[PDB]
Amino acid sequence: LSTQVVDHYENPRNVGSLDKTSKNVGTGLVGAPACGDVMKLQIQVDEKGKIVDARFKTFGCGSAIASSSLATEWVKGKTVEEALTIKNTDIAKELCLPPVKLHCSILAEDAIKAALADYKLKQE
Amino acid sequence: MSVDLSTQVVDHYENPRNVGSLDKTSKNVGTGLVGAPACGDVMKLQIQVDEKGKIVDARFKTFGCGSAIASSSLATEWVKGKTVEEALTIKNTDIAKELCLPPVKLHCSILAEDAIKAALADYKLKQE
Amino acid sequence: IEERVKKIIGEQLGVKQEEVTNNASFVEDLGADSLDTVELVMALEEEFDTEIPDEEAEKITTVQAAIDYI
Amino acid sequence: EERVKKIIGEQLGVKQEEVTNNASFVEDLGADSLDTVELVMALEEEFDTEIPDEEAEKITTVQAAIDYING
Amino acid sequence: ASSRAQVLALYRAMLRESKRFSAYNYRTYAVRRIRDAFRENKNVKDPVEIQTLVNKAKRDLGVIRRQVHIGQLYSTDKLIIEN
Amino acid sequence: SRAQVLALYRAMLRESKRFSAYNYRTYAVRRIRDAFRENKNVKDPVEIQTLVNKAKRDLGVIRRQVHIGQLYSTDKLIIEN
Amino acid sequence: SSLRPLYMDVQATTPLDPRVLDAMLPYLINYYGNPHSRTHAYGWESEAAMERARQQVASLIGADPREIIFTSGATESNNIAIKGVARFYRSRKKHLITTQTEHKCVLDSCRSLEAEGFQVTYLPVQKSGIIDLKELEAAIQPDTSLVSVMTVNNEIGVKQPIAEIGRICSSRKVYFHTDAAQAVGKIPLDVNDMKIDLMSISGHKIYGPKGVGAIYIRRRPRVRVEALQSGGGQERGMRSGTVPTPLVVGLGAACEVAQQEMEYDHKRISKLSERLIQNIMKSLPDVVMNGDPKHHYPGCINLSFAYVEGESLLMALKDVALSSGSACTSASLEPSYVLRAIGTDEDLAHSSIRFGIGRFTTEEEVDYTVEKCIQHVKRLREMSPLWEMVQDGIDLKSIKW
Amino acid sequence: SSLRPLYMDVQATTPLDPRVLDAMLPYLINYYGNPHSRTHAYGWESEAAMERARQQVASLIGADPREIIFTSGATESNNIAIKGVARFYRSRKKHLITTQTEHKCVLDSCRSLEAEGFQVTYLPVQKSGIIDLKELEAAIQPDTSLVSVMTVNNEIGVKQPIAEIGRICSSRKVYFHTDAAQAVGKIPLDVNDMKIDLMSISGHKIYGPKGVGAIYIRRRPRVRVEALQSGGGQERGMRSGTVPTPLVVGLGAACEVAQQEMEYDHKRISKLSERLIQNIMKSLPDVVMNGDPKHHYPGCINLSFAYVEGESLLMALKDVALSSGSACTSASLEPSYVLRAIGTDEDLAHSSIRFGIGRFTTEEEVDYTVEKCIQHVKRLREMSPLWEMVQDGIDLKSI
Ligand SMILES: *P(=O)(O)OCC(C)(C)[C@@H](O)C(=O)NCCC(=O)NCCSC(=O)CCCCCCCCCCC
Ligand SMILES: *Cc1c(COP(=O)(O)O)cnc(C)c1O
Ligand SMILES: *Cc1c(COP(=O)(O)O)cnc(C)c1O
Ligand SMILES: [Zn+2]
Ligand SMILES: [Zn+2]
């Protein structure tokens, strides 16, 4: 169990929720199949396409919680196109996740991309 | 100081009784040397009888476990001054009862009995 | 925070701090039995890091006696 | 009496005559430092004492040992 | 003619010795069980059964002594709730 | 050093001789003797420090096991007479 | 080198009772003789200790000493019962009956027998965790050789109706085995009153030493068992190998002590269990206890905290040694089959943890664990999306992979 | 005079080395966690100690730690090796090879396999107790899967030619298993140098605790073995059940200490053994040593005292704990099959006793045993009818 995972555990950054009704908020609600690890990650995008803040809530193991906290921390102030380059393998590398817990990283990536997809879907 | 080893057996071992040998040539001594089958326990028992059929003394030498030695010594104590016919009444079960021998050591008693009978057969056979 | 043995005694016998008069007796006044008194004197040994020996401890039956000994 | 000499020989395996009072364990009796430790311990067992290390350090001769084993 | 005094010293000893257990679980269990046990048998009147309980308590006193000593020989950290 | 070494030797012998068991006692004493004597002529200071530290660990073990044997002693051997 | 956490995992193992260690040490120090050495005193004293221990176990469970076989643990015991009975009657009987909540050694032994051509019925359990006796009766076949049902569940603590199962098996002339590893020394057990034919016993479940156990094989209406460990014929030929003297001595000491303190332990353990449950429930809603409280051993309390994942809570309680039947934290990500058997919703299956209250547990440990439990369940709920959705009344419709 | 007798029976079991007990107690007191509890600190420390001990054993025998499986004893190990290997390859190979002097666990496992449709060859041994390699080579069949030969015999102490057997078995694609209960920590063992595929180790034979053992299962060429104990899959699925932490800890400590002291122990043990033998032989005639002294471990000395029964001698030496292969000492009266196999005349087979010299045996113990042995052998010979007849000469005497 890596130290980075413990730091993001309860020291989690950006825990919370945003207003799902905002046309400028993308909400990704993804659940995993194998287990019950569920991640909800919401991002808010400015007029210039930059993510101005993000909040999350996850029901899952410590490694999933930390994976999502790190995820929102990383999408800090990046472009909606920039954020697409966040890779689950970069997450697992950042957190030193063992093979048994990679489903957490795959879930975090999935959540990010689902949320960004929601944003684009609201601009139409 | 032991388990299924009775105290009587210990007395007849640590303190063997009537251990020795007589002169087989005296014509008045019957010597029976019989050995056990499964457990190579061998017993040599000599008895000396004066006129009138009474046993005047008895001696033995035994190659075997403690229960066999003690069984033979007890045999010599019992074969003291009894009738040659009296000795015919010595039963292995009386020995096993006297010593509280478990089933694993009964081979001793059955051998001791045999030895007695072997000695008596030679004596009678000594009278042409 | 001085001779606060009263606190200790009160904790052991569960009596209001006001009923711990120096003239109080463990058995006659505070409702303790002989066992409770044993655990009490041991509690004082542990609180003040002492070893009030048996030959002296046998006579500790009053609050003023306990204060006196220490 | 002062038969510690006997002990010394027993410890060093030397003839009772070769335990001269003026003899030194190492210089004369062929002992090493370990033999000396085991020797003082043997005296601790024989005379029921506890000559401390700071006191044992001064025991280098037979006459010194005899002297100490008198008080 | 009461063995009361003999009991009391025992109680004292059995508590004192038990209080030296290094381990939280063994210490607490030993002390509490000693207390509850003496209290539960306080109303016994049969002298023979009382002597029985006393002898058993002595055997348990030797056991507690030896085990507390060993626990000191191989002690470890206190529990989080100890401080 | 040297004096520290000898002090160690004395300590380990004194503690070893308190073993309640004949086998444990005799074995401990004899092995300590043979060990120090076997290493008497070693010159490398690092290996010497290693052996000394090992001797300290074995001294703590000897203390604890001697105490344990005292708490749970039994009859002496027939050969102790 | 920081402070140590509270031990609340007594179902995995229990500490040695210092009395037991005192019972063992003489044979670890001075009495090292082999009990099978018949020709000297070391053997005699070792055998004496072994037989004394045997009588101790028999006294605890109400059997004859000759009916107690020493083993290396409850796992070996269950292997001997299932494989031995199954194989002995193989020529005429090839059907066995057990339950789906049985320990993994029973289940996997039965699995190997299935791979060997046997028929096995794994009885389902009601949502309470207790089997339905009628399905047991109707499931028994004429070629049924063995019925195996554990006494107390190791994960939820439910007590099965052992006595009635014994009556049923007897009336059907079927051997009855019980895995009692979690019951010996905690609840009364009498093989004759319960019509029990074989029983499994674990040493380290009742504050005894690790690496030793026992199996009761009834000798009255004699029970036949094929030995699995070949050798010199120790233990009436049922378990060849050198009887580990110190371990069995410790086992006997543990069983005797358990017979002495069973009632007291049940009183205070029950009090602490009720305290923990009642205090946690009054402060946290949507917490569900797994297992029927009407037939339940209070020392094992399995609780599901809705909307919170188990391992996240365990990580929250870094100061308390606990366990959970959560998919996460399991080698092969796999949810507890016990919880699946009682029909637990997947969320609560992932939201369950097990508290063990034992001979040495203090009220302080219980209160500390309760407080941290409330605090961290609250914190994790403020972090949980399912909580938020329930408080908002969303509709279960997440997206997967 | 309730004094205790000398222990000269190290082959049956040995005392704990105080180092091993000191290694064990913390896990009997404070570190009581289950090593398979992965979710808290108690389990973590138990697992840590267990794996460290594994590295200790492997280090003693020169194996990879992944090749050490913990069991309840050498008996369980031998059962796992023989029955496991035999069962795994049953589909294509049903012949096994062992010897007539192997321990009863190997023999009875082979017996059960015979009841399971396997054919088993029990190789005879020369009068020296050493198997004949030519008969081993010639005995292997195309469907031979496993060869089982113990390293050192527990009744006579003879050392088998392990390395050559390994070469032969390897060259024939046959698994090689050895019951090493009597060799680990007493004579050098290297699994790779000896081409060994499976090996059994018993804790209480090497001053470790009773109730724990190990089985070495090679991973290099890999060996397939069917698990005998069903369960949750602990120990790579080979031996389900909760690993007894204190026991494995003690076993590891015993292996490390044995690796440290093996040479010293062998030197002084051998010297004392020669002392005992030479001193007994010079004072009692017609005493015969069972087993070739040219390839023999000095810790196990089996001697037949002609014209004297074993148990009577054992009772004579009430001050020394010994053993004998005399029928008149077994529940089911049965003479040592080891002695019968090496061709000892049945009579002398009944006259054998076994002296074991161990890490803690003293020279005083040896001299005492020798003196009492001489005294009581003479006394019993003056009581022996076979002695008398031999001095006078004769043959049979009926049955
Ligand atoms: P002095 O007359 O000058 O003596 C010479 C000495 C040794 C003191 C010193 O000058 C010297 O020569 N040093 C060179 C080497 C040395 O000092 N070695 C000291 C360390 S030796 C060592 O490792 C002791 C071995 C301990 C093992 C004992 C184990 C006993 C069994 C344990 C039972 C539980
Ligand atoms: C703990 C447990 C076991 C384990 O048995 P061991 O061999 O002692 O490890 C078996 N069955 C049950 C029900 C258990 O709770
Ligand atoms: C002592 C011995 C055994 C017994 O193994 P356990 O650990 O007692 O189960 C097996 N084989 C040999 C060669 C032995 O000497
Ligand atoms: Zn997870
Ligand atoms: Zn006999």
Side-chain angles (χ1 to χ4, degrees), chain A residues 1-19 21-22 24-45 47-54 56-75 77-80 83-86 88-89 91-92 95-100 103-109 111-112 114-124, chain B residues 3 6-7 9-10 12-13 15-20 22-23 26 30-42 44-46 48-49 53 55 57-58 60-78 81 83 87 89 95-96 99-104 107-113 115 118-119 121 123 125 127, chain C residues 3 5 9-10 12-15 17-18 20-43 47-48 53 57 60-63 65-66 69-70, chain D residues 1 4 7-9 11-14 19-20 23 25-26 28 30-37 39-43 48-49 52 56 59 61 64-65 68 70-71, chain E residues 1-5 7-18 21-38 41 43-44 46-48 50-55 57 59-64 66-77 79-81 83, chain F residues 1-3 5-9 11-16 18-39 41-42 44-46 48-53 55 59-75 77 80, chain G residues 1 3-37 39-91 94-103 105-110 112-126 128-133 136 138-166 168-172 174-188 190-194 196-219 221-262 264-266 268-270 272-273 275-277 279-281 283-293 295-308 310-317 319-328 331 335-339 341 343-344 349-362 364-370 373-377 380-381 383-387 389-393 396 398, chain H residues 2-37 39-89 91 93 95-103 105-110 112-126 128-133 135-136 138-163 165-166 168-172 174-194 196-219 221-235 237-262 264-266 268-270 272-273 275-277 279-281 283-293 295-314 316-317 320-329 331 335-339 341-344 348-363 365-370 373-377 380-381 383-389 392-393:
Chain A
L1 192 165
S2 78
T3 167
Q4 24 277 33
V5 173
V6 174
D7 185 359
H8 280 72
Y9 189 42
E10 259 162 358
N11 255 1
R13 332 296 151 65
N14 302 122
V15 176
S17 59
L18 305 178
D19 183 354
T21 50
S22 171
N24 291 92
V25 175
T27 175
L29 172 69
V30 49
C35 52
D37 295 337
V38 173
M39 286 195 202
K40 176 191 114 170
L41 180 153
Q42 301 181 299
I43 71 192
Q44 189 186 31
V45 176
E47 58 171 22
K48 308 179 193 62
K50 256 209 180 184
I51 313 262
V52 201
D53 90 321
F56 85 89
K57 288 193 181 172
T58 81
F59 157 85
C61 85
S63 296
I65 299 268
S67 293
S68 33
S69 171
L70 178 60
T72 73
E73 190 178 351
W74 275 5
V75 189
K78 299 177 178 46
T79 310
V80 180
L84 259 57
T85 66
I86 292 174
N88 72 77
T89 88
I91 298 174
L95 296 178
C96 291
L97 294 193
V100 190
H103 70 284
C104 298
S105 51
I106 306 174
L107 187 64
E109 184 190 347
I112 283 195
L116 295 171
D118 178 30
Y119 172 60
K120 293 173 61 178
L121 191 284
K122 304 171 79 70
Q123 327 306 288
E124 229 39 90
Chain B
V3 53
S6 149
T7 169
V9 173
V10 175
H12 283 85
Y13 175 76
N15 281 2
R17 330 193 179 183
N18 306 127
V19 175
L22 302 176
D23 183 354
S26 171
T31 176
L33 173 68
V34 315
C39 322
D41 292 336
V42 173
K44 174 193 140 196
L45 179 51
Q46 301 183 299
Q48 188 186 31
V49 176
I55 317 178
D57 197 7
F60 85 98
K61 287 193 180 173
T62 288
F63 159 86
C65 86
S67 295
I69 298 193
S71 293
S72 306
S73 172
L74 177 60
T76 73
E77 188 178 351
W78 277 4
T83 310
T89 66
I95 298 175
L99 296 178
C100 291
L101 294 193
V104 190
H107 76 285
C108 298
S109 51
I110 306 175
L111 186 63
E113 183 192 348
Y123 171 60
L125 193 284
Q127 323 304 37
Chain C
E3 306 304 54
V5 317
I9 300 188
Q12 212 52 51
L13 308 189
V15 300
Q17 188 70 346
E18 331 308 75
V20 187
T21 55
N22 306 41
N23 88 88
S25 294
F26 300 156
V27 179
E28 293 86 340
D29 293 325
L30 305 187
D33 63 18
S34 17
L35 306 172
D36 299 336
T37 60
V38 172
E39 308 174 35
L40 187 168
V41 55
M42 291 187 60
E47 170 60 28
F48 293 75
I60 293 80
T61 316
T62 70
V63 182
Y69 181 82
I70 305 188
Chain D
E1 180 239 349
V4 315
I7 285 329
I8 301 187
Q11 217 54 51
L12 308 189
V14 63
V19 285
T20 56
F25 299 158
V26 179
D28 291 325
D32 64 18
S33 348
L34 306 173
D35 297 335
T36 61
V37 172
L39 186 47
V40 301
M41 291 187 61
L43 292 195
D48 196 309
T49 210
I59 295 80
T61 70
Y68 185 102
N70 292 331
Chain E
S2 282
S3 58
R4 176 190 192 269
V7 172
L8 286 189
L10 211 39
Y11 191 55
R12 177 184 306 116
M14 295 187 76
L15 288 176
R16 186 189 312 193
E17 197 67 36
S18 317
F21 264 122
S22 176
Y24 169 83
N25 47 340
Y26 293 157
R27 174 172 63 251
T28 59
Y29 170 77
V31 171
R32 176 176 5 78
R33 189 70 191 95
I34 297 160
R35 293 181 59 268
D36 296 343
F38 275 78
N41 297 326
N43 296 316
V44 175
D46 180 8
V48 61
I50 290 175
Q51 194 63 350
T52 298
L53 293 174
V54 167
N55 296 340
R59 326 197 225 103
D60 293 21
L61 177 55
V63 158
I64 288 172
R66 293 177 299 263
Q67 286 304 306
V68 169
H69 195 337
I70 294 190
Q72 286 179 355
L73 280 179
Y74 300 96
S75 56
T76 191
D77 308 8
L79 296 181
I80 198 178
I81 68 182
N83 295 324
Chain F
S1 295
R2 175 249 184 181
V5 172
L6 283 189
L8 208 38
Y9 192 54
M12 296 186 76
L13 288 175
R14 290 202 294 105
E15 194 67 36
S16 156
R18 312 215 307 176
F19 263 121
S20 176
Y22 173 84
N23 50 340
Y24 294 156
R25 173 171 62 251
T26 59
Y27 168 75
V29 171
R30 179 176 8 81
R31 186 69 192 95
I32 295 161
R33 291 181 57 166
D34 295 344
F36 276 78
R37 188 87 70 185
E38 185 188 33
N39 298 327
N41 295 316
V42 176
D44 180 7
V46 165
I48 290 175
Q49 197 65 350
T50 297
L51 294 175
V52 166
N53 295 340
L59 178 56
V61 90
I62 288 172
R63 300 187 185 283
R64 291 174 297 188
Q65 288 305 306
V66 169
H67 280 254
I68 296 303
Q70 287 177 354
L71 280 43
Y72 299 93
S73 56
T74 191
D75 307 8
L77 297 180
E80 288 159 307
Chain G
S1 69
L3 305 181
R4 304 177 61 87
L6 310 182
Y7 198 83
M8 302 289 290
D9 205 26
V10 292
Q11 281 82 28
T13 189
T14 57
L16 272 187
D17 187 299
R19 291 163 285 200
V20 172
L21 182 59
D22 193 78
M24 297 169 60
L25 278 167
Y27 307 95
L28 293 175
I29 300 164
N30 303 107
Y31 308 146
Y32 52 87
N34 185 324
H36 314 291
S37 292
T39 68
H40 54 68
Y42 292 94
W44 302 333
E45 43 183 36
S46 295
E47 178 189 27
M50 169 178 63
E51 296 296 345
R52 289 196 279 259
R54 197 183 313 261
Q55 181 65 70
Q56 287 171 324
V57 174
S59 288
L60 172 56
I61 67 176
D64 181 304
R66 286 167 297 185
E67 297 180 66
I68 294 169
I69 288 72
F70 286 119
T71 65
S72 70
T75 305
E76 180 174 10
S77 295
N78 287 339
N79 280 259
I80 293 181
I82 294 171
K83 293 181 183 181
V85 170
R87 300 222 179 104
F88 192 94
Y89 296 70
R90 145 175 233 151
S91 312
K94 303 207 60 190
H95 177 237
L96 293 59
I97 295 168
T98 190
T99 82
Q100 296 178 331
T101 62
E102 301 300 310
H103 205 255
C105 41
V106 174
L107 291 184
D108 198 47
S109 295
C110 295
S112 79
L113 294 180
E114 290 191 275
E116 276 171 50
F118 291 77
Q119 256 40 45
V120 174
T121 294
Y122 304 87
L123 295 168
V125 295
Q126 311 167 318
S128 61
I130 300 170
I131 67 149
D132 190 331
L133 294 168
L136 168 53
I140 299 177
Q141 304 174 5
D143 62 321
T144 299
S145 58
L146 176 66
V147 167
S148 180
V149 179
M150 76 193 306
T151 303
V152 169
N153 183 266
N154 57 288
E155 293 216 38
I156 62 182
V158 174
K159 304 200 284 185
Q160 295 288 353
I162 294 300
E164 282 296 45
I165 301 170
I168 292 171
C169 294
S170 176
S171 70
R172 302 299 291 277
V174 180
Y175 290 77
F176 181 27
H177 161 257
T178 185
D179 184 354
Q182 289 289 348
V184 174
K186 304 180 201 310
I187 62 169
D190 184 328
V191 291
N192 286 332
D193 290 352
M194 296 171 173
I196 295 173
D197 298 314
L198 306 93
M199 176 184 291
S200 294
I201 301 175
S202 172
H204 75 100
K205 304 291 178 124
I206 61 174
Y207 313 93
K210 295 171 185 56
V212 74
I215 179 174
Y216 164 84
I217 312 171
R218 172 178 296 280
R219 74 153 306 177
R222 181 144 87 93
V223 170
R224 303 170 181 272
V225 161
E226 184 176 295
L228 305 190
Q229 182 148 308
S230 306
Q234 291 79 32
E235 294 289 300
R236 308 182 78 86
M238 286 300 206
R239 204 284 181 171
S240 297
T242 285
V243 180
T245 297
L247 300 177
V248 300
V249 166
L251 172 65
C255 292
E256 180 174 282
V257 177
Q259 188 174 351
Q260 295 175 354
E261 302 291 347
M262 179 187 299
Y264 178 84
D265 279 4
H266 193 92
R268 62 160 292 191
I269 285 181
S270 50
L272 293 177
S273 172
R275 183 183 189 77
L276 178 151
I277 299 173
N279 286 5
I280 285 184
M281 282 212 159
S283 314
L284 293 170
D286 286 329
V287 50
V288 171
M289 172 171 173
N290 298 315
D292 181 2
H295 305 116
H296 176 259
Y297 172 64
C300 173
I301 305 177
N302 190 291
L303 300 181
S304 292
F305 302 94
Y307 318 119
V308 175
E311 194 210 79
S312 66
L313 182 54
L314 288 184
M315 203 168 317
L317 303 94
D319 322 301
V320 184
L322 297 163
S323 186
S324 174
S326 179
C328 309
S336 175
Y337 53 102
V338 175
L339 291 185
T344 285
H350 285 109
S351 305
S352 71
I353 67 173
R354 181 185 61 184
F355 305 86
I357 300 177
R359 172 105 54 78
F360 300 91
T361 303
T362 70
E364 292 197 352
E365 286 178 326
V366 169
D367 293 347
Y368 184 98
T369 303
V370 170
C373 192
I374 295 167
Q375 166 187 15
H376 295 101
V377 172
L380 291 172
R381 282 183 170 176
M383 296 170 64
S384 165
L386 303 187
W387 179 241
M389 315 201 328
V390 171
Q391 296 318 129
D392 299 14
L396 301 310
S398 301
Chain H
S2 45
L3 305 181
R4 303 178 61 87
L6 310 182
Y7 197 81
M8 300 288 289
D9 203 26
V10 292
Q11 281 83 29
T13 188
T14 57
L16 272 300
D17 189 299
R19 291 163 285 201
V20 173
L21 183 60
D22 194 77
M24 299 171 61
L25 280 167
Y27 304 90
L28 294 174
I29 300 165
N30 305 292
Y31 308 144
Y32 54 92
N34 185 325
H36 312 291
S37 292
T39 68
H40 55 68
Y42 291 94
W44 304 335
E45 43 183 36
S46 293
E47 179 186 25
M50 169 179 63
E51 295 295 345
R52 170 159 51 268
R54 195 182 310 261
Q55 180 65 69
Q56 286 170 323
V57 173
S59 288
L60 172 56
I61 67 176
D64 184 1
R66 286 170 297 185
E67 296 179 327
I68 302 304
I69 294 169
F70 290 120
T71 63
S72 70
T75 304
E76 179 173 9
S77 293
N78 287 339
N79 281 259
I80 294 181
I82 294 171
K83 293 181 183 181
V85 171
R87 299 221 180 104
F88 191 96
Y89 298 72
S91 312
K93 303 177 167 306
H95 177 237
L96 293 59
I97 295 168
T98 189
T99 83
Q100 295 176 329
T101 62
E102 293 297 310
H103 204 254
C105 41
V106 174
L107 293 184
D108 195 46
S109 295
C110 294
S112 80
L113 295 180
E114 291 191 275
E116 277 172 50
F118 295 77
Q119 341 274 153
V120 174
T121 294
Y122 307 91
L123 294 167
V125 295
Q126 312 167 319
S128 61
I130 302 168
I131 66 150
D132 189 331
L133 291 168
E135 294 172 334
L136 166 54
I140 298 178
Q141 304 171 4
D143 63 321
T144 300
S145 59
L146 175 65
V147 168
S148 180
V149 180
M150 78 193 306
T151 303
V152 170
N153 182 265
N154 57 288
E155 293 217 38
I156 61 182
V158 175
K159 304 201 285 185
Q160 296 288 354
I162 294 300
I165 300 170
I168 292 170
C169 294
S170 176
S171 69
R172 299 300 293 277
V174 180
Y175 290 164
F176 179 27
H177 162 256
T178 184
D179 183 354
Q182 291 289 348
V184 174
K186 303 180 201 310
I187 61 170
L189 288 196
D190 184 328
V191 292
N192 284 333
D193 290 351
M194 296 171 172
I196 295 173
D197 297 315
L198 307 94
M199 175 185 292
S200 293
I201 301 176
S202 172
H204 74 100
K205 306 291 177 124
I206 59 175
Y207 313 94
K210 290 172 182 55
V212 74
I215 178 175
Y216 163 84
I217 311 171
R218 170 179 296 279
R219 72 120 27 176
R222 180 147 191 97
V223 173
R224 301 266 41 198
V225 162
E226 183 178 295
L228 306 189
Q229 181 147 307
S230 306
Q234 290 79 32
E235 295 290 299
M238 289 300 205
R239 202 284 181 171
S240 297
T242 59
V243 180
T245 297
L247 300 177
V248 300
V249 167
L251 171 65
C255 292
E256 180 174 283
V257 177
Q259 188 174 351
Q260 296 175 355
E261 301 290 347
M262 179 186 298
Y264 183 87
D265 280 2
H266 192 91
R268 62 165 292 259
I269 284 181
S270 64
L272 294 176
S273 173
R275 183 184 190 78
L276 177 151
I277 297 173
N279 286 5
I280 286 184
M281 284 285 159
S283 314
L284 292 171
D286 287 329
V287 50
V288 171
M289 171 172 172
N290 299 315
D292 179 3
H295 303 115
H296 177 258
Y297 170 64
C300 173
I301 305 177
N302 191 291
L303 301 181
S304 291
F305 299 93
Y307 320 118
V308 176
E309 201 282 349
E311 193 210 78
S312 65
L313 182 55
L314 288 184
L317 303 95
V320 184
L322 298 163
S323 186
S324 174
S326 179
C328 307
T329 61
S336 174
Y337 57 63
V338 175
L339 291 185
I342 75 182
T344 182
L348 300 212
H350 285 109
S351 305
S352 71
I353 65 174
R354 183 187 61 184
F355 303 85
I357 299 178
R359 181 186 306 171
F360 303 96
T361 304
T362 71
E363 182 177 343
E365 287 175 326
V366 169
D367 292 347
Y368 181 96
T369 304
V370 170
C373 192
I374 294 167
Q375 164 188 14
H376 296 348
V377 172
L380 291 171
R381 283 181 171 175
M383 294 172 63
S384 165
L386 303 186
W387 180 243
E388 189 180 69
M389 315 201 330
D392 299 14

